[PDB]
Amino acid sequence: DHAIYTAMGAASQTLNQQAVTASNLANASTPGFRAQLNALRAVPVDGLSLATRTLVTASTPGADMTPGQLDYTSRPLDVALQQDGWLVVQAADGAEGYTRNGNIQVGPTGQLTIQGHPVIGEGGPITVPEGSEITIAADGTISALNPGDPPNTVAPVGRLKLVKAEGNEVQRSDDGLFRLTAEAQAERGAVLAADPSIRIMSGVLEGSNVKPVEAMTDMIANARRFEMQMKVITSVDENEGRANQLLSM
């Protein structure tokens, strides 16, 4: 009788994995996006005798760090990181989140931002002059030129902070900013150090990394597994219903 529960649990976890894949497909154009992996884990139950039940629970190990392509928009202050670059921004609660979304905006008071989160460079949240044109170097230096002034008045005003993360030690957060895991945080310190080995380029913006072929194959496999589990449910129910007639007299 309990064989129905493992099958229904498998069907429910397949539905959850389908939801994850659909969420991955939905944001196929958000700049600086990391796809969500998914996998099924077997969870056997150890009873007394004849261990014949092994459930399944869907799980997501984490984002895969394969960089996507980058569109050349020629915008002066659009940056794209290297293979494992990470722009460090300040989240809502003061934690330092890591992103690859290079679309940097400027507020009225010269404050830099990314989707409302102030990007922090060498020091604190960097603020450029009021209405000056901004240029990003090949390694994170920020140059400002006040409009109307002669071109020989361009001056450095700050420097970005770029950290290098391997990818297997970073976990996503609820808001969507990757942070170090507990062990990696303990090993490398609470806050990372701005390594000088990372180089970036301006004028390009990196897209998302979602594989349509992987998405399609996952969807097909999920649908087929769901159908098989439903057939198992039907068979078990029919067998139990016909077996209960034995209880009569």
């Binding site: 884990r41 056997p44 139950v45 007394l48």
Partner: peptide, 21 residues
């Protein structure tokens, strides 16, 4: 012993650990 037989003390609790510590 054999399943379906009778025994003096109850079965131990059953657990399904997601990941072994």
């Amino acid at each position: 012993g054999v399943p379906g037989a009778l025994s003096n003390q109850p079965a131990p609790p059953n657990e399904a650990p997601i990941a072994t510590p």
